[PDB]
Symmetry: D4
Subunit: 217 residues, 8 copies
Amino acid sequence: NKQFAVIGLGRFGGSICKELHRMGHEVLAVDINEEKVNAYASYATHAVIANATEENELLSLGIRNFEYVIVAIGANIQASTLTTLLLKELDIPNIWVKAQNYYHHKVLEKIGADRIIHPEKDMGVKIAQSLSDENVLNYIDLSDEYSIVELLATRKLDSKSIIDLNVRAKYGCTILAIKHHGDICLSPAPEDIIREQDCLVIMGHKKDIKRFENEGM
Amino acid sequence: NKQFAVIGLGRFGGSICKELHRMGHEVLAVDINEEKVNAYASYATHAVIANATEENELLSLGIRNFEYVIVAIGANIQASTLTTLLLKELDIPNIWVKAQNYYHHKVLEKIGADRIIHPEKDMGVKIAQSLSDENVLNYIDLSDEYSIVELLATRKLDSKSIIDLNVRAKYGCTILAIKHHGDICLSPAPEDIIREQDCLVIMGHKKDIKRFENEGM
Amino acid sequence: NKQFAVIGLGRFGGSICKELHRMGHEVLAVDINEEKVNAYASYATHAVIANATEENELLSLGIRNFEYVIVAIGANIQASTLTTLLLKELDIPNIWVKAQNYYHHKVLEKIGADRIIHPEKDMGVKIAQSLSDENVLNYIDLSDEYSIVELLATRKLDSKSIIDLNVRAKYGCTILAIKHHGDICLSPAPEDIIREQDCLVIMGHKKDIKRFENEGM
Amino acid sequence: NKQFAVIGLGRFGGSICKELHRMGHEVLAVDINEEKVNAYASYATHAVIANATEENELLSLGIRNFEYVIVAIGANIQASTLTTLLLKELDIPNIWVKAQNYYHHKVLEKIGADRIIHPEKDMGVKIAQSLSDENVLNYIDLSDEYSIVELLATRKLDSKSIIDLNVRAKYGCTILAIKHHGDICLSPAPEDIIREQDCLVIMGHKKDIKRFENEGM
Amino acid sequence: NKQFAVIGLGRFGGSICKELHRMGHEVLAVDINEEKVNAYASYATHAVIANATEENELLSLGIRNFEYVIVAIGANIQASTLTTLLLKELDIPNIWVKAQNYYHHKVLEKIGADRIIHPEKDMGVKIAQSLSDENVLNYIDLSDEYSIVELLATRKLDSKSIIDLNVRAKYGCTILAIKHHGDICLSPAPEDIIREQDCLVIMGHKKDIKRFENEGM
Amino acid sequence: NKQFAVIGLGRFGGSICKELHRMGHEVLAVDINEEKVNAYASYATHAVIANATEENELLSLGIRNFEYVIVAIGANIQASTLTTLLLKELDIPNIWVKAQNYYHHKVLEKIGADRIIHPEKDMGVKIAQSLSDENVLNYIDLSDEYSIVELLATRKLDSKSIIDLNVRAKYGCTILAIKHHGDICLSPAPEDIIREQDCLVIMGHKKDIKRFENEGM
Amino acid sequence: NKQFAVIGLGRFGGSICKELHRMGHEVLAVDINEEKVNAYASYATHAVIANATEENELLSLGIRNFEYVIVAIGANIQASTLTTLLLKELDIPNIWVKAQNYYHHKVLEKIGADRIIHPEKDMGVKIAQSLSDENVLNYIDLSDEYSIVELLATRKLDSKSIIDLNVRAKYGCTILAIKHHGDICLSPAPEDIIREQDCLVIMGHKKDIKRFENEGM
Amino acid sequence: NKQFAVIGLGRFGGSICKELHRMGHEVLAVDINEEKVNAYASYATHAVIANATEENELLSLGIRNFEYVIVAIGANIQASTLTTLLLKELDIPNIWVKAQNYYHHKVLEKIGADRIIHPEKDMGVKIAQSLSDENVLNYIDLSDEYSIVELLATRKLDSKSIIDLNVRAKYGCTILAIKHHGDICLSPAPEDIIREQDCLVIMGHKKDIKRFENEGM
Ligand SMILES: Nc1ncnc2c1ncn2[C@@H]1O[C@H](COP(=O)(O)OP(=O)(O)OP(=O)(O)O)[C@@H](O)[C@H]1O
Ligand SMILES: Nc1ncnc2c1ncn2[C@@H]1O[C@H](COP(=O)(O)OP(=O)(O)OP(=O)(O)O)[C@@H](O)[C@H]1O
Ligand SMILES: Nc1ncnc2c1ncn2[C@@H]1O[C@H](COP(=O)(O)OP(=O)(O)OP(=O)(O)O)[C@@H](O)[C@H]1O
Ligand SMILES: Nc1ncnc2c1ncn2[C@@H]1O[C@H](COP(=O)(O)OP(=O)(O)OP(=O)(O)O)[C@@H](O)[C@H]1O
Ligand SMILES: Nc1ncnc2c1ncn2[C@@H]1O[C@H](COP(=O)(O)OP(=O)(O)OP(=O)(O)O)[C@@H](O)[C@H]1O
Ligand SMILES: Nc1ncnc2c1ncn2[C@@H]1O[C@H](COP(=O)(O)OP(=O)(O)OP(=O)(O)O)[C@@H](O)[C@H]1O
Ligand SMILES: Nc1ncnc2c1ncn2[C@@H]1O[C@H](COP(=O)(O)OP(=O)(O)OP(=O)(O)O)[C@@H](O)[C@H]1O
Ligand SMILES: Nc1ncnc2c1ncn2[C@@H]1O[C@H](COP(=O)(O)OP(=O)(O)OP(=O)(O)O)[C@@H](O)[C@H]1O
Ligand SMILES: [Ca+2]
Ligand SMILES: [Ca+2]
Ligand SMILES: [Ca+2]
Ligand SMILES: [Ca+2]
């Protein structure tokens, strides 16, 4: 099993640490705040109060032993940048860091961060897509033009069949799944019916899907 | 006109406001900080400096005209809670609010928030899934058991065919798409080939996919 | 005997705790300030320094055992709201909370507070009634129209008898008590005399009493 | 004209100012905070931003015209004390001041305050009486021994008559009023009936009433 | 020997404590600052860190045993006033307090301070008298009209005799002493000579002395 | 014209400025606080808001015109020191400065201050002399050994004559003045009488006077 | 025109700006503090108040016109780093930055700083060399082994000649200059004499010079 | 060996302490910050946490034993000045102090500082000389007119000989050294060649050198 180190137990890093630990991985939670450590003590293999900008405390943690180190420090850009620098000079294989803005991304890029993440910005995009289009529940982009979308079926689609709703020739899309009352249906047959308030998964071009939304539902 | 209002120009709300504006929607940016307002002025239809906890300043914005109001206030839970309370008493149809923790979710729930979002927490889980499994790029959960995953093809899958990589019978899964050098292939034929570093889209049970990952790739 | 818990040893909560303890009830004083606890240590069954927003410290207090919990936190609305939420999730029978303003009342209402109190606001009304009318010492409202009032007798009423001051037919009111030099007289006979600077208790309609005040005294 | 001035727009003083204004009196609202002044501007004849510790600003208000000046300053004891001192040296007839603790009462006493009020402390006692005894709604003390109490009638008293509930001979008390469904009854006849959840007004000795509570209801 | 207590080890109180201790009196130095106590530890009989606003700590000091208590607290008027109040309620014979301004004097007056001192204000007057008149070194006022002054002899008075400088008939004053090279001369004879830069002590009317200054020296 | 400038409107400097102005001198009040300047505006010829550490603001005041500049800055030793330094480099004739402690005296000494004053320290000694000896009202030291003292006559000295109270032979001292009911007597004759509570002025050796106090009065 | 811009008017940057201006170069002084800008206004061609972390304010300065931009920001490492990042992305040719510590040097290095300076650190070494060796006034290092040193001639070297003080054969060094009473001598002849307290310039190996110091002087 | 004491472990003082310790001298590092002491603990003979403004702590250090004491306190001018004063009163032989500005220099001068240093200001001058003239690497001034300069050789001087570049007659200067690829050449012969990007050391008049720069290279 791979060993993970998470520095900065915020909302983001906290989720990572908690979710990773649930996966049965060796995860070390690191934070400068004692209260933070106490909170996630029950959600980590080891939890240590430490200042990650201190090289001596860093070596005391044995952070060189870890293949993955996650820097989830946000507000204090100084701490985030300085920590990443220390890690890179310690030849840490994989360093993932949470960024605050465009310029924070740039400096992390230059000092050799392996992966940079913008949690709020990315979610901001996702939720915005669901505001303008209440029909969509969730989605994933395959490219700039193609995407898979989970839709909330309306009354317009109630008791409609898959062959009634021709998507492969009329809109160039394909229905991938139907979720009814919790029960799930994968690669549903052309005779399969969709009822309102079910979860509908469609695959195809972005413009095509929206066209199906405007006309079909 | 569908009018959107975004209160709290943080990393999350800022993205929402910017992304909503990009889609060509009437969007009003609202913040207590003048510097924030000046920043997102170029990324909104209208940008106004205002304290959202003030009912008078709130009415001055013409907030009755908005169908959607997004409360993206984070650090100051008092402001977030009080703003949401004001909106519901002003009979705003749809109120989406960013939450800080479990208990903030609860109080927002009781006072009639329509949708509660945990941006950092949700991304934390997503990134954690990619930490433990370097193969996965992105995914979407259909249910507690079923998921769609975009995989980074390895050398083990280089120049391998779909009928060669039998997933419908061997693993109970199905290949949805292949992305090669940017070019995309939807519902690929059994003769379609996968090269290394291509994007592979697979659909099925979580455990099944992971089995394909360990043995297949 | 019923067991009471008082969180927030301010001027209000302090009085409650002190007065309840004097009544020979089991009362627990709780405050985040060590100095507060030391002050009311002599006025409680048990006095414990604790942060009421901490669920672990809350369970350590055994707050689930109490039928009555009084939240007298004022300035910090966050603490007051969060504490009440914790209590409600712990299924506490009776939760009384001190409020700061109209909107603080609303959120406490929504999260299931059993009784909300506005000490200063209510007293503000009481004292205001005594400013405009120096004759009144204290009072109680039976309804929007009817009230009982304690009056300071003037020279105009000196050596006047109850039958001389006809209140039942002339003003529709009734004299309930006379307090002379500390000595008290209940349901006084029609032959009973009132001297100046005595305490006079009258019952009837608000407008009628004021009429008696303008004309009678 | 009787002119009232309220200094210190807190919860207490704010209510006073608002309530005085409601009675149709000439009321001047005074506060050091501009936001406070703006708030109670609609609830006062005149509202002026001013530091009450400044004699020049005080004279500028035209404070000689006011017969009543209310000092409702709480947190800053220095401001409360200094303001009161200024008023008496400006020969203001009646100076009522809100007190924070025992020692604040003492110093205000020595410097010639006409009336000292303890809003939170007084309500604390009142509420405490209703905590230990859920039957009582409100009350007023005639003396150290005698009191008038408004009771919430129980099922034990449902459909019971006044002559049935003998209190003048059995408990030494007297029923003053009955409030049923909003309708009020003053000095009710011996044939008048009490239904559950009605408001019952009783007069007598404190111990006597409590005896009626334990045995009668 | 009399026992003295000095609260507030500032520049003023510090001098008092140091000077009193040098006189061989039992003096207690009291201050809230630990650093202050350490400084004057070598200049007092007993030195104790204590908050003088705390009644319990006050009794622990045994402050009731002292005939003289000096309150030399300046900046914090709250502490100065509250301390004096505690002392007066403890029936302390002689309470001397340092004042900050006119209104601080008034409240101390009302709460029963025995003597109030204005060190800086009084010295301000003294030094101002020496600025306008460089001839005067020091002085003492017998009344509004009469004073004793120590003068710095000029060249105009060099080698002048007392009988040459007639002061009893010409100016109505009298020379009291001559200080030459450190050597002192008391009640000097009419034949006694004064040299420049000696210290000259004159007694008489203020206007008369100034007249002697303008014409004589 | 002799022009005086007072920098630092504290208790000390404020008195100086006020007292100098009372004598009819051209006095400029200077302070960094606008509120201070407004206060002593009525007690100065000119009052200007200025930071005395700024050479430009200093020259703007027209400080070259002043022969006397008084630095009465206390708390901020940096400001006091820097101001004094500027004045000497601006070749100001006479610079008097208020000192905070021994070391502040030393640095001011080295940088060419003309006179250094310790207002609180000097009064502390004076008051201490009156604490140990309730008989003394005020005094002045002629040297290390000789002093003039104003005494409050006791009953022991009531109706006693000067020849009765022989001090020139019995104690080696001399009576300089007697103040009775406000009326003053200078160089009183051997037949002049002293009544109780009169002011007695004695001149001589410190030990001699104290001997007269113990035995004589 | 060669245009220089100096950002951060500290002790270091202030000297740079002042010195550059003295040489007759077009120099722009930039600082976030208005007081700083006002100060160096007289020592720059143009002086503008600006926050250097703001790209808009940066472009407003006309920073594209400058070939040299000096970042002399010290305390705020965030500002220093962010400013440098902005400059390189604005394609500024030569960016010189003042560093605070080793790690600040590293990050500035990675983001493309052209020259990094350690003013205090460099002087610290220089002064240290003069502490241990009182003979040396100043020096310059040619390499790790070779240096040029200016020495203060002792009495041991007074009236000694260059051929008398043989350094080319005896110590392997060479005398470059002699400064006597201000008068300078370059490449002095073998007959040239050295007097005490003259400035002696020697060139050679570090160890050789020190040997000459111990034995020769 | 001489014993050194360094107070104020900043960038400047830190370098001094580190460099001196490397020279094998007895050096004491003194700082009020515990973190500072821990940092330079490895770079000093003794390292002690102490407040240098405290005379008692100063004597505890045994600072009187040291011949050299370096005050490297910058930001807090009060501490720097007060420390120097203490040292001078302790008769410390050599006291070197770091200054912040012109006026800080003056007070240090007056209170008897032996040497005053301006690290940033001096370096500011040095670097400024290298900005305007990119050819110069480092230099030393012999006087106002004469200086030794280290130059970066250009292509214009590539493969040029010393006799080709006549400096003694044509420009009045002399080439002192050539540094090629790290290898150094001292007092190079007239036949010696210079290649580009070598370090060139020239000695002569400032204007003459610049003339050689403009025309020669
Ligand atoms: N030098 C440091 N060493 C260790 N932990 C640190 C350091 N600096 C910051 N942290 C921790 O990082 C955590 C989260 O950082 P912060 O909250 O500033 O970023 P954020 O973006 O606001 O967080 P979120 O992930 O909730 O958005 C905090 O709990 C803090 O204690
Ligand atoms: N009462 C208010 N009215 C209007 N705007 C407010 C109010 N309170 C806070 N804001 C704004 O909301 C913005 C975002 O708040 P904050 O930065 O605390 O969120 P966050 O927890 O950092 O979330 P994010 O992940 O979006 O950064 C702030 O820039 C602030 O100016
Ligand atoms: N999280 C907490 N846990 C325990 N006690 C708290 C907490 N937050 C506040 N308190 C306490 O509540 C007490 C009173 O609250 P606060 O004084 O803010 O309200 P208030 O309205 O100003 O008081 P008052 O009743 O005098 O009007 C304080 O003594 C404080 O210590
Ligand atoms: N010197 C002053 N002049 C005028 N107004 C003042 C002064 N000092 C305080 N105030 C005002 O008095 C108001 C009430 O004071 P404060 O909030 O401390 O009282 P409180 O103890 O909270 O009592 P309450 O129960 O009424 O809230 C404040 O809003 C403040 O603006
Ligand atoms: N509650 C308290 N108990 C004990 N000591 C106190 C208290 N409050 C203040 N002091 C002390 O009083 C001392 C002097 O008071 P402060 O310096 O505020 O008055 P000041 O007029 O500025 O002094 P100075 O006599 O130098 O003019 C301080 O050392 C402080 O520690
Ligand atoms: N740089 C400055 N320029 C002008 N005025 C100043 C400066 N620094 C301080 N002052 C003023 O000097 C005044 C007196 O200073 P401070 O109150 O610290 O003296 P203090 O020690 O309290 O002496 P006092 O016994 O006179 O009160 C303050 O009101 C302040 O406004
Ligand atoms: N973002 C910014 N934009 C413009 N100027 C800034 C910014 N941040 C700081 N400065 C300015 O830089 C100046 C120097 O910074 P600072 O005083 O922290 O440096 P220092 O470490 O003291 O170096 P020095 O040895 O030069 O004094 C400050 O006067 C400040 O006004
Ligand atoms: N009273 C004191 N006793 C001991 N050390 C002190 C004292 N005051 C300041 N110092 C120390 O002096 C050190 C440097 O001083 P400071 O950083 O204020 O000057 P600076 O000019 O900013 O430093 P630099 O040399 O980096 O320019 C700090 O580490 C601080 O701890
Ligand atoms: Ca966030
Ligand atoms: Ca209150
Ligand atoms: Ca003072
Ligand atoms: Ca510096």
